[PDB]
Amino acid sequence: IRKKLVIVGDGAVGKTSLLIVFSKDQFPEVYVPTVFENYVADIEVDGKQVELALWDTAGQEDYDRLRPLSYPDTDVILMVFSIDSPDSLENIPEKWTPEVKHFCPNVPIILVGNKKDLRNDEHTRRELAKMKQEPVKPEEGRDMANRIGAFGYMETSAKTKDGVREVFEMATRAALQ
Numbered sequence: 001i002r003k004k005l006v007i008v009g010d011g012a013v014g015k016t017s018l019l020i021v022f023s024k025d026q027f028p029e030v031y032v033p034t035v036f037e038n039y040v041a042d043i044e045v046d047g048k049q050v051e052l053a054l055w056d057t058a059g060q061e062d063y064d065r066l067r068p069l070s071y072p073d074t075d076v077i078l079m080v081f082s083i084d085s086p087d088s089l090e091n092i093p094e095k096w097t098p099e100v101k102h103f104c105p106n107v108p109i110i111l112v113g114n115k116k117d118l119r120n121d122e123h124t125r126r127e128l129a130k131m132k133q134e135p136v137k138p139e140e141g142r143d144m145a146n147r148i149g150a151f152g153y154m155e156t157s158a159k160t161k162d163g164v165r166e167v168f169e170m171a172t173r174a175a176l177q
């Protein structure tokens with residue numbers, strides 16, 4: 001009935017924004033604070049009411065020895081990259097997956113490609129082109145989810161809210177089973 005969820009990924013990919021959208025979607029409405037550490041949110045998925053305890057690693061991306069103190073007893077990981085940052089996707093296999101598999105051995109991972117609203121954004125394409133890069137394609141996220149053994153792959157926009165509810169439903173199912 002209580003499941004611990006930890007959200008990880010590079011700085012500025014939208015970890016906190018995703019927690020905010022989910023927490024503002026709760027009913028009855030509650031004031032959503034600025035930080036998420038053992039933050040209790042109730043969700044109903046399929047039959048069951050579940051308490052999700054949310055932990056955000058934003059602000060700790062460069063504190064390699066302090067960040068893993070939040071990992072014990074985790075039930076599901078949300079591992080996030082940004083579709084507007086191929087660098088953040090490359091850190092999925094190179095940084096986040098080895099870390100999560102060491103500290104959370106058999107814990108399900110949901111791979112989340114956030115900022116999907118920027119895939120066709122003209123400003124984003126122009127800025128990425130300066131570095132000889134382009135937005136992440138959906139096939140690339142799906143392939144990465146298979147490579148790292150993720151339970152599932154989902155694309156979201158915290159800005160438009162599309163896909164956010166579905167990410168948390170999938171994470172709850174994975175935590176339950």
Ligand SMILES: Nc1nc2c(ncn2[C@@H]2O[C@H](COP(=O)(O)OP(=O)(O)O)[C@@H](O)[C@H]2O)c(=O)[nH]1
Nearest residue numbers: 011012013014015016017058114115157158159
């Ligand atoms: N266009 C767009 N911007 C986003 C999205 N999610 C977050 N952002 C923005 O990206 C920036 C970083 O978001 P934040 O939640 O603080 O990332 P965190 O460091 O991973 O916790 C903020 O300026 C947000 O407005 C999204 O889905 N689309």
